RNA sequence: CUAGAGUACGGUAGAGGGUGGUGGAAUUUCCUGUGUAGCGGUGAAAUGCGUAGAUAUAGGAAGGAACACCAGUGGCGAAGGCGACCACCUGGACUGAUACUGACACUGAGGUGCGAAAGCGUGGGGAGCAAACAGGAUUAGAUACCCUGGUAGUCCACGCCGUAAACGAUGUCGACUAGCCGUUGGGAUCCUUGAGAUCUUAGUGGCGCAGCUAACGCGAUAAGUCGACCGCCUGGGGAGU
């Protein structure tokens, strides 16, 4: 992923706050990394060194998400149908 | 290579300078194949054999 | 320490990135055969080493440097 | 981006070879890469046979160019008899002029 | 037939020694093996018979002339040095001595290791 | 709340993957010239190859796979594994500064994946090497070792199988405990010329005190002192049947 590319998400999800740490910056740059990826693996079939990399975020996301949840219900359902998940 | 003076000076001018290029310890290497095994095990005896003699040398050198 | 001093040919000098252009620096680091020199017996530190064994096999596809005394 | 692209053409094909300059430069600014240098070494003598000749004349030059210009040169060098070989770079900087035909002369 | 400034090929094998006397276009003019120099068997890998097969491809050669030699040793065996000192006892300016070796960088297998 | 854990920012090092492309040395087959009696092999020989012109030697063509020297107790990868050069996509680690989130962590029965090599299926491709095999020799005897040949295979694409002395014969994670000599990479401080200096993290080696151990031996990369969860052992054969 970019750098720019980086830099437009953190101004769209910002908490208002101009801080990368919250959950909702977090779990929006894993997702945007993983929805590039899915050409590189119809290509490249037998890339397995490559393809471990790939479900280390995928777990990454389910469990922020889960810390979202454990904590509220309103910031949760404000970014699930947001992204489209689950 | 070895141009040229008497005959005696270049014949021990080519037989030392093809040992210290080479090329007559890697020929008497090319005509059994070692398994990589058997080459991982020079890997590990010369490594044993230069650093113990790192260390046994310092006993003449005290 | 003439192996001491040839470490400090890369490393004393600013020229960290060497290129495969200097043809007057490479032939310090080849034999007369052709093939390339160790590093214990020119000194050299071991990043350089790597960087120096690039910059040959660039210059030998080239043709600015041979392989062996053949051709 | 930022491309080292050197290539050696055939000895007879060495005065002709001013033409071949712009030629391939012109398509590259078609692209918008812009050149930063272009050096051209002269005819020396190889180190060995390629294709049973021993002159060459080499030929530098740096070009910053797309991902476009690139699929230009690569293919424009294997559909040539002028030129025997050629190697293309990738440097993660910028280019200054000048570098060693001072020091060559 | 007058030919000048030959060229000796030298190729020692393990078990067997051949010199040949050529030009510099690559054509025969003499050649001599241990072999026939009637040895046949241990005696034949000596680098004793590497001399006198060496002096015999060196009696031949007056045929043509030949009063300048260039030497290229090739092979690992044993008299890869005694043939050389073997040559200008005939009579031979010898002028330079080059090591041809053929040497793979990676090459094909070789076979199996004796027992 | 910020000491665990994770993010944003600079910065290095690497045979970490996948898809194409291009080299040079050597081997073999073939063509052509010169040239003429053996070559090859071995404790020694023989089978074999040779004037129907071999080996040698020079010129040319085609093709296949491996990648000298660098190369190292050296690197990277979760493990198996990974060495020609370039482009192409692509994962993670290190190191520094700085802000943010504020415990978001650990382990993991079942379940899900990646699994050397030999082998199996359909299609390619056939340089060398080489089980099965054939001949010679040795041999009371020799299916064997040694010699001359030689097929599946090894190579590529797609799919399968799932075991190895799959080894550090040592499960993962966290915290404390004398030293000294090396080495990869990275910041420091420092008089500055250093063949510099000392300190600090992340690896990787050689000795060693306490301590433990049946002994051998490990010893900040524990088999030392302690925690959290899991797997497994109960005399030898019978039998991992
Ligand atoms: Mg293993
Ligand atoms: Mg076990």
Redesign the interface.
């Known amino acids: 992923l970019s750098v720019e590319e980086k830099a437009q998400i953190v101004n769209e999800y910002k908490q208002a706050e101009g801080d990368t740490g919250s959950p909702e910056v977090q779990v929006a740059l894993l997702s945007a990394n993983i929805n590039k990826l899915q050409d590189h693996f119809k290509a490249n079939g037998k890339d397995h060194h490559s393809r471990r990399g790939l479900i280390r975020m995928v777990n990454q996301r389910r469990k922020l998400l889960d810390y979202l949840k454990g904590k509220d219900v309103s910031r949760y359902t404000a970014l699930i149908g947001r992204l489209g998940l689950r | 290579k070895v141009k040229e003076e008497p005959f005696d000076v270049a014949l021990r001018r080519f037989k030392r300078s093809c040992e210290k290029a080479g090329a007559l310890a890697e020929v008497r290497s090319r005509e059994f194949y070692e398994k990589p095994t058997a080459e991982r095990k020079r890997k590990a005896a010369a490594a044993v054999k230069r650093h113990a003699k790192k260390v046994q040398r310092e006993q003449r050198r005290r | 320490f003439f192996r001491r001093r040839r470490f400090c040919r890369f490393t004393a000098e600013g020229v960290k990135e060497i290129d495969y252009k200097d043809l007057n620096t490479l032939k310090a680091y080849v034999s007369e055969t052709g093939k390339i020199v160790p590093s214990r017996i020119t000194g050299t530190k071991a990043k350089y080493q790597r960087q120096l064994a690039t910059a040959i096999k660039r210059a030998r596809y080239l043709a600015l440097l041979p392989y062996t005394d053949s051709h | 981006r930022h491309y080292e692209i050197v290539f050696l053409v055939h000895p007879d094909q060495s005065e002709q070879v001013g033409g071949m300059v712009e030629r391939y430069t012109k398509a590259i600014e078609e692209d918008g890469g812009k050149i930063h240098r272009l050096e051209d070494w002269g005819r020396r003598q190889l180190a060995y046979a390629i294709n049973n000749v021993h002159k060459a004349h080499y030929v530098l030059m740096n070009v910053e160019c797309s991902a476009k210009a690139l699929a230009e040169l690569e293919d424009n060098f294997r559909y040539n008899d002028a030129v025997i070989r050629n190697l293309v770079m990738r440097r993660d900087e910028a280019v200054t002029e000048q570098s060693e035909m001072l020091k060559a002369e | 037939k007058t030919v000048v400034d030959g060229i000796a090929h030298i190729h020692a094998s393990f078990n067997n020694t051949i010199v040949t006397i050529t030009d510099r276009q690559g054509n025969a003019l003499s050649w001599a093996t241990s072999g026939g120099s009637g040895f046949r068997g241990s005696r034949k890998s000596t680098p004793f018979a590497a001399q006198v097969a060496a002096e015999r491809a060196g009696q031949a050669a007056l045929e043509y002339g030949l009063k300048n030699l260039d030497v290229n040793v090739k092979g690992?065996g044993p008299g890869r040095?005694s043939a050389?000192?073997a040559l200008?006892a005939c009579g031979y300016k010898?002028?330079?001595?080059?090591?041809?070796?053929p040497?793979?960088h990676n090459?094909c297998?070789?076979?199996?290791?004796?027992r």
């Open positions: 690992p040095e050389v000192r200008n010898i002028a330079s001595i080059t090591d041809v070796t040497i793979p090459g297998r070789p076979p199996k290791k004796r």
